[PDB]
Amino acid sequence: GLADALTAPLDHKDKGLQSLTLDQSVRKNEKLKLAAQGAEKTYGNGDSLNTGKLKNDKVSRFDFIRQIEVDGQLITLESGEFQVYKQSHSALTAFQTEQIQDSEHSGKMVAKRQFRIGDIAGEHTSFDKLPEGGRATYRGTAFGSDDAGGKLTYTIDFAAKQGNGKIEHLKSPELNVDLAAADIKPDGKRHAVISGSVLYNQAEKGSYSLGIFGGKAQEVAGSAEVKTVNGIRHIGLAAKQL
Amino acid sequence: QVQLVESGGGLVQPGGSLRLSCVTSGFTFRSYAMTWVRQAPGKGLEWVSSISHSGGSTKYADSVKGRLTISRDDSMDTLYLQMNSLRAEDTAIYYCAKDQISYPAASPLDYWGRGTLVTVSSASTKGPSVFPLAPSSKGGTAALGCLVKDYFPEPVTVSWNSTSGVHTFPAVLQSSGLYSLSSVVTVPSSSLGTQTYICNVNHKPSNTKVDKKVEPK
Amino acid sequence: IVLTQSPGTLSLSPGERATLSCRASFSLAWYQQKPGQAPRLLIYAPSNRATGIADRFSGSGSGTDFTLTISRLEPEDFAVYYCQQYGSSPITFGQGTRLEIKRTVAAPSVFIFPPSDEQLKSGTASVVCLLNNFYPREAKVQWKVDNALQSGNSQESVTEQDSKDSTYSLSSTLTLSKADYEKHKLYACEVTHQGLSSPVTKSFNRGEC
């Protein structure tokens, strides 16, 4: 399954989402290498990840190494785990770092564990053609560092063009937060987005942002930045209707 | 304070199976890739296999692919190498090593274990025969020694009378598949017919303790 | 990528500068292995040094030609060094390069040892020739039974460079059956060495002293 994404060509009977363009996940001159089982594949900026071979509504794990060439030397920028959550009309990636380049000593590596979200893409629902009314309930997954078992629940009131949800069952209690009510605003590319506050007993503990995906607003996908006592923690978000 | 400890090596029949373990300490095992490297007797280093920090991606050299399988248990900080269909050219000392980064076979190996010996042949365990290399009867020093012949597997320990002037030669694989080494000591000819020169030969692959006396004539 | 380290052996003195070369066809690393010990990481690209590795060691070069430079040789720096590329699978190592201590030529002290009567009872006879405290490492031992010239029955074993006098020791072992042994009287050990004006030969007559 994971090895097929790195080696097998595109089949159209493969279930969507079939393609996920790696924009923010691989930067212009960098070179991201993904490994799973005995397979491995190299990606550049703008290349497509064969998400069709991956399982829907699950987190897929790849070992990764990020590299760029400076002068005439391949410095290893970053090493760790590359995560992908796949849905029918959306998908998002994340990087669990284990070592990063020593900025002040060329060729050296320093241990440092970060978790960040990479690329949130799919068939963006245009803001102008959203459901003109009604109420849809999205249910899915919230995943952070070393935890892919938190539950996303979100509801969108398309009449009021509002939205609210919460996160539950993450192992870290600071992270199971409420996603406060917020507006559905248009993006610069007219994508339908929702930017709101993270709450935790009705007080500011961060912020979140979701995009609506699918021609019928079937799915939402985004990320939550949650202020904690030990710094910011990034959580991936993805949910779908029934 | 990083330490790697290999174990599980030994004597194996051609086609047999062995499992090596490398228990680690002094670092967060779960964050780094691990690597096996082997050294055939008298020759250079050869990369065997590497496993990612997660265990989700493994790499092998083409000469061992399919027959050797690398694995890890993070809860026990242990690395494994399951060796199947073991051929004669798999005889070597196997070193477990830690990588600098989580991605397998893409970084230097900054810490090494002390290796374990894997011997693959049809020969069976045998204790050594020890014969005297008696000194001559005719510079002002004399040479005496002990011949440790026909033993399997390696290695033998030769201590001389429980000290200096000793040369214990490396073993040679004889034409019959058994090992033989000599250990010589140069003493003054005055000492001949004046001191006991008993050599202490110990072989634990076969559990044999033998102390033979090199005397003149 | 095949790596070839030239030359195979380097004989230097302490305080001398050592140049070790590794050719490609990057990122390369260097390792050191002392007699009877596991390898250790020395430097890595470009010239970063592992913890506990003194500033004596340094690396340079790009393209194909890579070099490991030890500025001031120390007596502990005399070992084998392997180069190793990792930025391209599969991982490949170099064949190695010895650093041995420099010294002048020392002639071998030659001894011969007839087979013991205990080994003769078992049915085998082994005749040993000892070449002790000599330099350089290179030499031969040619065995000659009844003043013939043996072939295919002797094996050589050479020690490691001594850490105190920088000499070597060799033992040649002539193997043959008991029935063959008692059919000949003269057994000789002729050694070839740079330190010998003419090959020194040690002999014993079977049955005498």
Residue numbers in the entry:
A (entry chain C): 15 to 256
B (entry chain A): 1 to 138, 142 to 165, 169 to 223
C (entry chain B): 3 to 27, 33 to 216
Q: What did the study's authors say about this model?
A:
To determine the structural bases for the complex effects of the two human Fabs on FH binding to FHbp, we crystallized and determined the structures of the two human Fabs in complexes with FHbp by X-ray crystallography. The 1.7- and 2.0-Å resolution X-ray crystal structures of the Fabs in complexes with FHbp illustrate that the two Fabs bind to similar epitopes on the amino-terminal domain of FHbp, adjacent to the FH binding site. Despite the differences between the two Fabs in their effects on FH binding and kinetics, and their difference in cross-reactivity with one of the FHbp variants tested, they bound to similar epitopes on the amino-terminal domain of FHbp. A superposition of the Fab molecules from the two complexes identifies the largest structural differences in CDR-H3 and -L1. CDR-H3 has backbone shifts of as much as 3 Å between the two complexes. In the structure of the FHbp complex, CDR-L1 has five disordered residues, which are ordered in the Fab alone. Notably, the Fabs affected the conformations and mobilities of two prominent surface-exposed loops compared with the structure of FHbp alone. Each of the human Fabs displaces these two loops of FHbp away from the Fab and decreases the B-factors of backbone atoms in these loops, which is seen as a decrease in the radius of the tube representations. Collectively, the structures reveal that the Fabs enhance binding of FH to FHbp by altering the conformations and mobilities of two loops adjacent to the FH binding site of FHbp. Superposition models of ternary complexes of each Fab with FHbp and FH show that there is likely minimal contact between the Fabs and FH.
